[PDB]
Ligand binder design. Structure first.
Ligand SMILES: [Zn+2]
Length: 259
């Protein structure tokens, strides 16, 4: 039902068994070596059209939680940046570690943040997220680093719903949440072709990792680790860590905007 996980017996190092692509040529995340970042005059500023974003529910997916958005129409889309076309926001989720010194999937010159936010979008040229996820130009995910420091009020509404989705599969109504409240003021970004960091690990993601992190308090981070990987009736298993480590960059180029 979701055999893969982040434990020693089913963690990232074993995903390749059920998902051979785990050892693919465009796997994410990757460490971003700023010294090797390339400047592409063709890159444009990110166009996050989230004004009419309509959040629906928060769901415990068995490895983290998703804040789902109505992607039935172009209510909240991602355009420009390194993209061609329109990409609808379908859901966002986070990745975190068991301690504040780790948790982010992408790293900056080996630097790890406490957590990492992923805003998932899909190319409207495909009719649906699933079909989109099968094409290299199908998905666009904006990664946002959460840096331990000042408590972040915008993160409040999210943390408050966690006690309502403790176990795998549990969901809760989660209306009127502005996804843009989780974005930094400066939208400088790094971009490279990659994949979803969780199985099926499809290589259809144009990664857009923001250079500027947003804040989160150590106390707020404790909150993320209170969730359960398990379904009610199963042994309790806390969601202490759900990040995939950096994967081989291989023949990929990380571009940076504005540089
Ligand atoms: Zn993710």
């Amino acid at each position: 039902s979701h055999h893969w996980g982040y434990g020693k017996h089913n963690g990232p190092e074993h995903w390749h068994k059920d998902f051979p692509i785990a050892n693919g040529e465009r796997q994410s995340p990757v460490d971003i070596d700023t010294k090797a970042v390339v400047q592409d005059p063709a890159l444009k500023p990110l166009a996050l059209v989230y004004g009419e974003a309509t959040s629906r529910r928060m769901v415990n997916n068995g490895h983290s939680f998703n804040v789902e958005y109505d992607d039935s129409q172009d209510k909240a889309v991602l355009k420009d940046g390194p993209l061609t076309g329109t990409y609808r926001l379908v859901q966002f989720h986070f990745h975190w570690g068991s301690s504040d010194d780790q948790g982010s999937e992408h790293t900056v010159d080996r630097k790890k943040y406490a957590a990492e936010l992923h805003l998932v979008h899909w190319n409207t040229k495909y009719g649906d997220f699933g079909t989109a996820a099968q094409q290299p130009d199908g998905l666009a995910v904006v990664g946002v680093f959460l840096k331990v420091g000042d408590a972040n009020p915008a993160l409040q509404k999210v943390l408050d719903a966690l006690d309502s989705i403790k176990t795998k599969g549990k969901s809760t109504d989660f209306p009127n949440f502005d996804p843009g409240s989780l974005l930094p003021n400066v939208l400088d970004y790094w971009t490279y072709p990659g994949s979803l960091t969780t199985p099926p690990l499809l290589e259809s993601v144009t990664w857009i990792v923001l250079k500027e992190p947003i804040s989160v308090s150590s106390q707020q981070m404790l909150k993320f680790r209170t969730l359960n990987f398990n379904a009610e009736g199963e042994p309790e298993l806390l969601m202490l860590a759900n990040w995939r480590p950096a994967q081989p960059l291989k023949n990929r180029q990380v571009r940076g905007f504005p540089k």
